Design a binder for this molecule. Sequence first.
Ligand SMILES: *[C@@](C)(CO)[C@](*)(O)[C@H](Cc1ccccc1)NC(=O)[C@H](Cc1ccc(OC)cc1)NC(=O)[C@H](C)NC(=O)CN1CCOCC1
Ligand SMILES: [Mg+2]
Lengths: 244, 240, 243, 231, 195, 212, 235, 250
Amino acid sequence: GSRRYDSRTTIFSPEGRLYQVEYALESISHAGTAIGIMASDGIVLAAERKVTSTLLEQDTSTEKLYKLNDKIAVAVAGLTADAEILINTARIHAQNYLKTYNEDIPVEILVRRLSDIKQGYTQHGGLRPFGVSFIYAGYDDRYGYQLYTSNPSGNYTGWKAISVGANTSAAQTLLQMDYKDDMKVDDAIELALKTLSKTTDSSALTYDRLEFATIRKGANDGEVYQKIFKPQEIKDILVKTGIT
Amino acid sequence: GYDRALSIFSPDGHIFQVEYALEAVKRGTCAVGVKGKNCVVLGCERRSTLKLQDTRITPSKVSKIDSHVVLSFSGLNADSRILIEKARVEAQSHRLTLEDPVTVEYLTRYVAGVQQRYTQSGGVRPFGVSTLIAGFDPRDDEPKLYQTEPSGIYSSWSAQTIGRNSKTVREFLEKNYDRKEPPATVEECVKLTVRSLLEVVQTGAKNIEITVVKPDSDIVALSSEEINQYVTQIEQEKQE
Amino acid sequence: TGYDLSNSVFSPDGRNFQVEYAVKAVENGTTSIGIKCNDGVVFAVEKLITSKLLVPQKNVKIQVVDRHIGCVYSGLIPDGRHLVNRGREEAASFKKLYKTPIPIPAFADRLGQYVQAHTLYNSVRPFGVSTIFGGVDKNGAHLYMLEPSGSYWGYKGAATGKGRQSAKAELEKLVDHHPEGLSAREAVKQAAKIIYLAHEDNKEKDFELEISWCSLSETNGLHKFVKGDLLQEAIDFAQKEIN
Amino acid sequence: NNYDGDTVTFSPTGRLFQVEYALEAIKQGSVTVGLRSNTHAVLVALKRNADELSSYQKKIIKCDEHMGLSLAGLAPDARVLSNYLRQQCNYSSLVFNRKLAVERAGHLLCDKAQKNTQSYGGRPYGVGLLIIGYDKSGAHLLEFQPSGNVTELYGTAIGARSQGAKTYLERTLDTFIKIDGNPDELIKAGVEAISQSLRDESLTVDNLSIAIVGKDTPFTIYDGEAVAKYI
Amino acid sequence: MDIILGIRVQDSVILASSKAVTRGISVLKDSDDKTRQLSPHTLMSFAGEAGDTVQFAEYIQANIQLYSIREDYELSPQAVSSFVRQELAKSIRSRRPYQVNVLIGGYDKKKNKPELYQIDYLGTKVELPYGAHGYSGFYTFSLLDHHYRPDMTTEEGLDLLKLCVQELEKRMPMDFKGVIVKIVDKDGIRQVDDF
Amino acid sequence: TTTLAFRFQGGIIVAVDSRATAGNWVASQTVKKVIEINPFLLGTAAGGAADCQFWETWLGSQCRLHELREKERISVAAASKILSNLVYQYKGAGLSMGTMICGYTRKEGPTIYYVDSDGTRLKGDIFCVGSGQTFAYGVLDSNYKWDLSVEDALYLGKRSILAAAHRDAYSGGSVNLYHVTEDGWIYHGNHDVGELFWKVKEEEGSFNNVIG
Amino acid sequence: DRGVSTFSPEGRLFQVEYSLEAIKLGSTAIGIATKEGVVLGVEKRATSPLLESDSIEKIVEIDRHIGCAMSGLTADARSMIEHARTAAVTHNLYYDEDINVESLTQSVCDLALRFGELMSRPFGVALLIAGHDADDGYQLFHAEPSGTFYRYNAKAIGSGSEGAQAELLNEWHSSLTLKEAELLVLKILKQVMEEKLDENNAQLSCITKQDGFKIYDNEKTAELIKELKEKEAAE
Amino acid sequence: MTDRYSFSLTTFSPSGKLGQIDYALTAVKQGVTSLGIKATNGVVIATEKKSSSPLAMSETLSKVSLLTPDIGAVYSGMGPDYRVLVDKSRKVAHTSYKRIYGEYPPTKLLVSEVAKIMQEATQSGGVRPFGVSLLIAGHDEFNGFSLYQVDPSGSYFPWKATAIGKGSVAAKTFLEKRWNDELELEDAIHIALLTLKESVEGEFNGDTIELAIIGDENPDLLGYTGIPTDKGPRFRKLTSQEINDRLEAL
Ligand SMILES: *[C@@](C)(CO)[C@](*)(O)[C@H](Cc1ccccc1)NC(=O)[C@H](Cc1ccc(OC)cc1)NC(=O)[C@H](C)NC(=O)CN1CCOCC1
Ligand SMILES: [Mg+2]
């Protein structure tokens, strides 16, 4: 019958590894680098677009950074199509929690549920896992500003500063060097860009090959604002830090 | 529905998928359980290749199943969440029907049953997780420590360890733990647990987690400085 | 290659090797025939007497569908029974909805589609039988032969099994020598002869003859078995021709 | 070789190897004999044990007051098929107030075994059965094979070394068929028949298993000291 | 079941609930506690159809306790009340709805404010300074309209509650065998044993 | 029916009548309304007869499975809650059951639980259940003290059923007495009202409404 | 790969035969049947000295009149025991009587072949089911994952099974007392066990008509071990 | 019987590649060239009508399809896969949007729904990916004119101008030289015809070229009058005659 053609996506190797999860991570390591940095007064999300063409419409484009709700955003690394499936699920889950409890969803709860969905694809169903790694950047009134990451295994962890996608090894060493705990947002903005600028496979880092976002309490009194940077705003912030 | 029999026998009488799930446990960070005269202590390793972590929000290694029972593990982290969740749901369901919290033996038996079901169900792989379940039965002061594994077998232990380099720390516990006289106090039990982890860990900084469970839902996690004091004390006595 | 390991897989030729392999099981089976006549059809089959311990006349192979259709097959006997069980269900639902008994061409397609369906998926095996069947309806007499692929045509005479070529040659002579037509009682006698002649290709074990027929005049359009005096008369006619 | 992975696959010569391997499980099974006259039908079965400390595996199963079988091969598969027969015999009684014909009993078993040989996932039955019974057309004996093929006979035998008993019955055909109105003599003929399949071992009191059905005799099984008469 | 009251004061929420369980012409029990602790700083009283009441209360209790263990965190009274409402809002369009009315008294530790929610079996939620279910409200609401002040102490609240129980004991047709009173504040939940 | 069970100094008394009715037709006078679940658990039956008989014997099977699985005798609370959760699933379907789960365990001590077919489940010291519950309450309440002796408590239970058996048209036959201690339940005999009434009347001097 | 319910050329089910190999790796379990009762004994086999041996539950009660000992992948036995207990109690509910030991065994063995592509594989555990009923008296059954069961006067399963079975062949007679049978299980267990036999690494049990199924204490078994050693030295 | 293929036929290889998606892209490469150019006041999409036989009527085979009155689509790769996608895309625009909001979906969201369908064929049981790349041009009130590309993986990108299929590499280079942000619609049509002539080999006329625009509203193509807010479809397929007129002043 059909047994002949089954890849058996949810099995263990003799060494006790999940073949498909390992290979999904190998796929993600070729995707454009995404960095998350958490400061005391906000969070930075920076991501490098995958080899851009000059005729690509830059201003009306979304590849790396996605909004989950007013308080939570994610940076993507891997298959965009796969990520969008998961993002819409996450967006719905957030609205269910709000509808149930009349309170915005705590960041960890949202992250856990999304990570639990990925886990299921590695244990049952005989389907391939999602070839996606997320950086979650969000705020709630329990833990404040939080950074998380999840990967195809469905395992998630919390971070002060983290990178996913390509050149994470080099990127994580640079972040580990210059990061400190009393850091501000504007300093974290500078760190994020400097790190990408050194780890990039491109010749020079330009405005048209970047997506940028901040989550500050920089609104008026005790409330959080999400800023998805416009092309011209990235151009200005790139000049202001002296990269171009 | 995906039906494939993934866990099956081999000519020599082995179920390789279950045995390979044990290899995943062997890869996982070390976890140790030691029970004293009036307490149980769960110690856990945390690998130090991860700096720039946020320890406030990062999932803790020891999980409360109920107010009186805890569960630590070694193996795949994502898999462990599924077992912990099921266990937590069963704990509340038991309180609802029996009007009494679960015994540690019962909770262990349930988790072990779930693990076993995944070894002879179609379309699923076994859990790549072994657990240490510890606590005190309702209105009882006798300490309980149990172990489970992917196959589904479970058993009670005076002291036990699982995960990477567990055979080294088990060797330590086998000669250092006296059945006739277990650790009489909390301090003695925690020290023996930290000592056993120091055979394997590396540095006693932010690499060791300790959770102490006492009778009548008295569970607390030790901070860095509190654990560091045991590390400092043990090393000074060692130089002799 | 490996194109022959799974059913419903096309080879580079455009062939389904699994169906062709089922045909080999049919060729291995005992001989069975069908003869179309003036106002009906006649079916006959070879039953190999494996042992003295077989009860004579009590291992019946020819099967009736509804009250007006007869079915006989060569190859895997159980597969043939499964097909007739379906045929009986198909005929029953037709009569349930449309009142009239199922016409033979209509019935032929019902089996044809069902057998063809078992060449569409790898989760099922093709049928290991060629089925000769037919009867009498409002438009007269019809004889059909259905194959593992689902292929069927109408026939003047039909034959399948180990002695099919011998039987086909003998059938072709009847078609040539009787252009105006063959009578029902004649066809029964000829059927006996052709089974006896076709037995030369399976002559280690001696055999038992079994005949059935549908005829507008002789059986009133219903399927009946040939027994007793009419059967012995047909056996004697066949015995006289081989010598 | 490459065409024996499952039952849904034909070989290049048109063989079903999984069905043939199931047939092989019957040849490994212990011998059992079936025979009949015009008044009675008899099953004789050589039971097998694991060792001297173990019991002797029961071979004969009752299906109705007028019908039952003996088995050779996988015993659990015989239990499944005998249970199906029990239901079908029972359905015929409750709905139609009619004792199920032994011939229909065979047809039903054939069709049940067949479905398992044409579908992916399933497997053929790994057992052969000898069904005896007395119905409205007198005594009957059937031979079931898990290929689906069912055969009505005067006498037969299946299992290991069954060829010895089958030859004897082929010689004795004219004698035992006319043992009418005499149960003990028909059993004696069956006990003598199964004896032709014995090697090194002989028929003992807890080794032999006999069953009989007939005109004024319900399907009853004899074991233990009740078969000491026939040794 | 029958009488359940609630009063929110400056620093606490006080719930009063009748002790009688009647069935036919017999008072089967006179010491019944018509409440369940959902979390350390959240208490739910209930009244309605026999069986449904306890079955619903314990079901909610199990769910909130499950959440507490999972997140190692106590849900706010507002969050618990919204969860309860939604369960009742589902219930009302079920094959057999829960016929249970509830009062949810809680202390929000983040806001340092007491909160009282009144939810009926339809899933109709309202935050109130004082609340009641059943026929009780026809006496207590007008009484509290007069005597209630927002800045009252817990002791003043208990005297205000005594005034309600006295009025109900005077004018209600049925003997409800007194009430069990419980106080919800910053220090959790405690029972007044002598009322 | 009339069934009662009360808690006191010396354990639990349980007393039931033995009449079955089909309208005004007296169906039986010799029915067993107490089911012995195990040496430490009793169950009383009031309401629909098949409903009680079927589900209380079923309850016993669930209690047996508990002690097989858990290697420990089931608690009175857990036993009662199995039955209450069961009938709650059938709520509205028309089950008619008024039950009392009485027994002793180490952790609980002597315990009585009232469970009925609307899903009401109540712990308590005294309960009377059935058509004649009010008649039993009248005698039991007016004579009850915690400090009753085993001898006096047994009699009060017996006398309370007799009182209801007399007045309630749908109660009677005979009295079945039980006593539950730390060591388990003890059966204290079947007492026919035919003889018991006159024996009580003469010795006690009560029942002066009746023609002596 | 290949189908789960596939036959070998010799006419055996691959998966069933492979599960039998798993059972040979398991710890030893022995059962002996007498007219005074049936005795069940097992090797506990703790993997480490820190493991509390009393938590090793390889002898199990099904009903008051039926007991059970296991060997192999013991985790697989949980659902088999659960089914057996339910079958026994359910039959008591439907028929107001104790269920026959043979009927119970048959019910358990019906689960065995309910696997394929139902559960994904056969059970990797063998069971010794011992009990008593009014009809056929004291009985001992060996239930395999093949779906087959044999009644035995005495039977050993596990790693030391073939050596222990040959010993039981010589020692068993129809007039054995219960005390004689108890010692005989201890004797044969001590012979096939790796580590030295004592009350902590071996467990005894029995089923009698009068007292039903009882697992022996470590204190009671210890005295039977001491009584056994003295009797062997006495000649 | 029954679909026993409940498992993924597209899986990760050791190198991290998803084979079936890569192979689907290879099929798109073999396909005939199609392109899209965005202007200030409109969008143009175009492709060659590769005729299977001269006896075949190429008018009956439509490579450029209307999805909504303001959205059109064109492809490169396997035609049958495209045909069913257009059916599904038309339906999803109604079921998941118009039947809810009473208006047609904006270009980006319809594209998003089509991408979802193509992604599921990459992960679901017993199915291969779609062997096509789509170019979807459209207009909506709040986003204006837009042009999107959708690949077999389910990924989609917005473009100022692009080309896919056979000679896409050369065609994209040609468009980079000619494209500016001040292009009027007529200028974009002119450039589209120039770009397409490079990839086409045989005949180059209105009968071998298929071209449609997303431009001004067309009241004459609405089919009715009387509702001022309904002003007609912005999608218009250029006729064979209309193409030839622009080929003279080429
Ligand atoms: C006293 C006598 C008042 O009825 C008790 O409640 C008694 C309790 C009892 C317990 C165990 C065994 C016997 C008796 N109950 C009855 O005797 C009971 C009264 C009753 C009848 C119908 C009811 O509706 C559900 C409720 C209570 N009598 C019966 O159950 C009689 C013997 N059987 C029937 O009426 C048969 N009915 C039952 C309902 O369904 C239709 C058939
Ligand atoms: Mg009366």
